[PDB]
Amino acid sequence: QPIGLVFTLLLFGLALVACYHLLREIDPGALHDAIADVPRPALLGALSATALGFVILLGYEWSASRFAGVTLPMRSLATGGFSAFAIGNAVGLSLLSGGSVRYRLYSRHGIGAAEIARMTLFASLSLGCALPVLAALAALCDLDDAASALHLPRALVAVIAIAVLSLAVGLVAFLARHRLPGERPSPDSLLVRLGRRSLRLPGLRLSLLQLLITALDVAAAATVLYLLLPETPPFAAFLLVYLLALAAGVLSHVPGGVGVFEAVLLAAFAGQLGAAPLAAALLLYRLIYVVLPLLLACLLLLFLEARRLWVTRQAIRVASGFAAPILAILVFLSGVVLLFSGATPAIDTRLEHLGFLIPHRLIDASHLVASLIGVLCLLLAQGLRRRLSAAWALTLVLLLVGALLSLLKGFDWEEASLLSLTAALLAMFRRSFYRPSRLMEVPFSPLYVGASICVVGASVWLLLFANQDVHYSNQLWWQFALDADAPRALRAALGSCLLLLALALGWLLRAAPPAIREPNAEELQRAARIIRHSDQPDGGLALTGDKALLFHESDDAFLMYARRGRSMIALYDPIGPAMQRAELIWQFRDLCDLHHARPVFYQVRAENLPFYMDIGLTALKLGEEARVDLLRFDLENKGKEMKDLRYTWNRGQRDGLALEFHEPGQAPLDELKAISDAWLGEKGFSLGRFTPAYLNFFRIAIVRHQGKPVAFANLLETDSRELASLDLMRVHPDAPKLTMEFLMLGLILHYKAQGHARFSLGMVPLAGLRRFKDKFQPDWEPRYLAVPAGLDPLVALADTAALIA
Amino acid sequence: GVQLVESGGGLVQAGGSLRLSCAASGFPVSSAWMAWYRQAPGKEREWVAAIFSAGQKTRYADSVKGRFTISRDNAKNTVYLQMNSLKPEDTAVYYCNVKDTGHWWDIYDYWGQGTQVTV
């Protein structure tokens, strides 16, 4: 990650340096004239081309879903496609990614995560493989101009295009795919192929349809760029250049490819075209096709939450919504907009009208503080996505003050408005942010600081380009005048850089958090009290004193976890009320980030998946939990399986296998450890160990065979008396097979008599077992294992298996 | 500790001419943006003219683009604004406004007491 961040920053800086060289021979007035020279029919055609491209994207998704096999309604599929493609195109995995938004939509719609990951991989690979073939097709079409545009001889371009096409049609199509076609497809359109692992690649018809859709999409994009530009080359060379630029921009991982795409366009069509018309076309195309779609998708997502999850009185903890991660995007956009407006000189007439009413030193101070507030909002955008109440309040106040300072600065209807709208939108979604955590303790990945550095560099580039009329001198910094705008921009840029550097240093020199430690007796007693006050007997595994605890700081909650390698594997869902469960999950996620460790969960209940999703964990079913319902369990009603169970009960009662219950810490121990030794003739994090205090914590039930203790099992209970679960099981080998079933049914009967509504038989792994568990005809619920960002589950499962012993 | 002192002494013009002086102490009146305004009786506030810097840039109002001709002494003295042909709407008080000085810490807008100018 640090290497990738450094490489991306270096590439962005090189791209900006190259861009400034290419637009060296243009003044801002020429660019403004070129922008104003674009006719209204050109703008209308640009909007129409963007709409057509978005219909084509809807197609992208429809084909991807048909490839995966997931069946979705047309409206839901269209909404998901538009949202994912608008969010992913504007920003690349910086705040929100296409995978994350499509997960948050489809998983809510009730679709497994593996299919969604398949869809995302298929769309990405389809675009990445369609780009080279279309580029080669355009080259084959018009190499006469392609040689001139790219500045290489036509022979080399022709031979490389032909070689690329031949390699694709041979290996990509037949030699490496039809030599090993495969036996059968799982969905309608697939061809699973041999290799190290089976691969899901579409059939010939689906591949042809996807290629046609991608060709139409890139044609629409090149078309909007083409028609927004007055003087144009032939469409084939322009399309080739556009495809190469898109590949270069998306290959650099820069969000939106802003640095390199413009650089390639300006380096390929500089001499043959007009620098001012080309720059105006590039800026207008980016604004129309990237910023406006992002704004529209953000508004649509917030409308969906404001209607489908606010009009109905859900009365639930508002998490996993799109409020936080999209409001963070809006706040980042507001921050970058303020930073950019700081560099550009104000409108002459507006500046004069303002300065004839407000003191000019106030204008300078407002400019500087507005730039600082822009940097602050840009940095606070990270806090909003983590759902911090303090971040919400601070960002709202800063946005309001920034709007006021933009009005006080050179009169700006635009910024002021945009900001007021963002502030109102943030205010309307207060309930999404709930954590009372402190901003100064917020972990910061290098990605966000890199984005901040990139935006600051962009602002300084805009400062250098826009204020090139005024010559540079050391007296500019000391200059203070109303008409002077270059000194203003210089001071604002210097202050923003100083503030950002100070904040980055302060957050980089922070002391490391304390390492994990084994809990002491007081924390064990606290955990026991919390478990007793809760209704999750599965949490009693914390009392073994083998897992670190993360107590919630309000009144009552905890979360067991253990660190293996670079992964902080956790136990079941945090114990406590639902209102504190999400907060504890967020705290655990923050803790893992500070330690640079990947968060991993284990055996997660189906109800809490929204929180695991919104902190950035991918669901993965791994087993089933049997749950015998004690509500009815009638002794008279019988069937094929129930008759043999009561026969077992009768045989055990006749044999003399009477079962006895004991209070906690009051059972014989030497016989119990003898039974355990016989059973094993250690392990943890799933069952526990044989410790006198650990077994003392819970009640112990022992079954006696002709008076001797032969088997026992640990009992988990709660004060709520809602659910009961079994901790660990041990039977002496000399006992008959009748013993285990009799113990099971005796515990079930006692728990039913005591009044407990439900009983738990444990969790059975997914994919020769489960035959014994299903004998008691229980209700079965899924159990999920969460992994971060859809990483490799093999490493996580191997680590859990290694830690289990 | 900056003050502005006016002296115009105008009662009646009837299409004549008069001169106004705005004394200044705190600032050198050399690199200090400063101007004049108008407060008609019962009306809102309007401006008349301005001097930007070094006695070079001087923007006038809409109705007095060529009527008036203001100038600055260029030293640490008063600036001069003069009256001209009959403007019935000019029967108002005239303030002396200073919004910028050489100081970078000066945020306040200092005004003048104003002179009753009538035709």
Author numbering:
A (entry chain A): 34 to 714, 720 to 805, 835 to 872
B (entry chain B): 1 to 119
Could you pull the original sentences from the published paper?
The soluble synthase domain binds a charged transfer RNA and aminoacylates PG in the inner leaflet of the bacterial inner membrane, and the TM flippase domain translocates this modified lipid to the outer leaflet. This modification provides bacteria with resistance to cationic antimicrobial peptides (CAMPs) and other external challenges such as low pH (1–3). MprF represents a promising target to combat antimicrobial resistance, as removal of MprF has been shown to sensitize bacteria to positively charged antimicrobials.
PaMprF was reconstituted into SaposinA-lipid nanoparticles (SapNPs) composed of phosphatidylcholine (PC):PG at a 7:3 molar ratio, and the structure of the PaMprF-Sb29 complex was determined to 3.28-Å resolution. In addition to the rotated soluble domain, both TMDs of PaMprF are substantially displaced relative to RtMprF, with TMD1 separating away from both TMD2 and the soluble domain (left, top right). Starting from the wide opening on the periplasmic side, the groove between the two TMDs extends further into the interior of the protein, forming a deep channel that passes diagonally through the protein, along the side of the hairpin helices, reaching all the way through to the cytoplasm (red surface). A previously undescribed, third lipid-binding site is located at the surface of the protein in proximity to the cytoplasmic end of TM8 and allows a reasonable fit of a 1-Palmitoyl-2-oleoyl-sn-glycero-3-phosphoglycerol (POPG) molecule (lipid site III).
